[PDB]
Amino acid sequence: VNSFSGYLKLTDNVYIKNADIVEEAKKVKPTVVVNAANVYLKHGGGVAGALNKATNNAMQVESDDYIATNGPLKVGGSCVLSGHNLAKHCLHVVGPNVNKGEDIQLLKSAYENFNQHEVLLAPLLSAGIFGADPIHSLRVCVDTVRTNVYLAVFDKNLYDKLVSSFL
Numbered sequence: 075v076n077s078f079s080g081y082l083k084l085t086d087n088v089y090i091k092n093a094d095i096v097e098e099a100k101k102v103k104p105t106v107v108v109n110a111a112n113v114y115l116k117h118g119g120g121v122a123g124a125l126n127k128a129t130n131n132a133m134q135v136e137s138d139d140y141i142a143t144n145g146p147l148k149v150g151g152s153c154v155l156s157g158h159n160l161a162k163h164c165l166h167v168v169g170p171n172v173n174k175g176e177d178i179q180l181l182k183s184a185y186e187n188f189n190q191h192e193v194l195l196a197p198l199l200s201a202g203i204f205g206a207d208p209i210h211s212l213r214v215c216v217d218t219v220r221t222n223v224y225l226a227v228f229d230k231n232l233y234d235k236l237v238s239s240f241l
C-alpha cells in the first residue's frame with residue numbers, strides 16, 4: 075500500500091492521473107520523482123522548468139555542479155540527484171527530443187531507467203515540448219517499465235485521450 079490517490083490502473087504496474095506533477099510531488103513526497111531532463115540538466119521549461127521552479131532553483135544549482143563534475147548525460151540515460159522539497163530523490167531521465175532530431179527508438183532505453191526503482195512518480199517521457207506522441211510514449215512505458223509507475227498528466231484533454239485510446 076502506498077499514498078498515491080485517484081489513479082486509473084492501466085496494467086499490473088502502470089497507473090495514471092490528470093495532475094500537476096509538481097503539486098502531486100509536494101503532496102505525496104514520493105521516494106522518486108522523475109524529471110523530463112535534457113542532457114545538460116538545463117531545467118528551462120516543460121516539466122523540468124516547473125520542477126526546478128518549485129525547488130527555488132536548488133535543483134538547477136545541484137545539476138550544474140553534477141554536470142561540471144561528470145559531463146552531460148546520454149540521450150536515453152539518467153542520473154539520480156536530490157528530490158529537494160518534492161521527493162527523496164529525483165531521477166533525471168533524458169528522453170529523445172523530437173524537435174532535435176533524436177531517434178525515437180531511444181524512448182525505450184529512457185524508460186528502462188525506471189526499472190531501477192521500485193515505485194516512481196513520473197511524467198510521460200518525450201511528451202510535451204520534447205515533441206513525441208504522448209500516446210506512443212504511454213505504450214512504450216507500459217511495454218518497458220516493470221516497476222510501479224504513477225504517471226501524472228498535466229493536460230486534462232490529453233489525459234482523457236490517453237485513457238480513452240489505451241489498449
Ligand SMILES: OCc1nc2ncc(Br)cc2[nH]1
Nearest residue numbers: 094095096097120121124228
Ligand atoms: O506547478 C506549476 C506547474 N507548471 C507546469 N508547467 C508545465 C508542466 Br508539464 C507542469 C507544471 N506545473
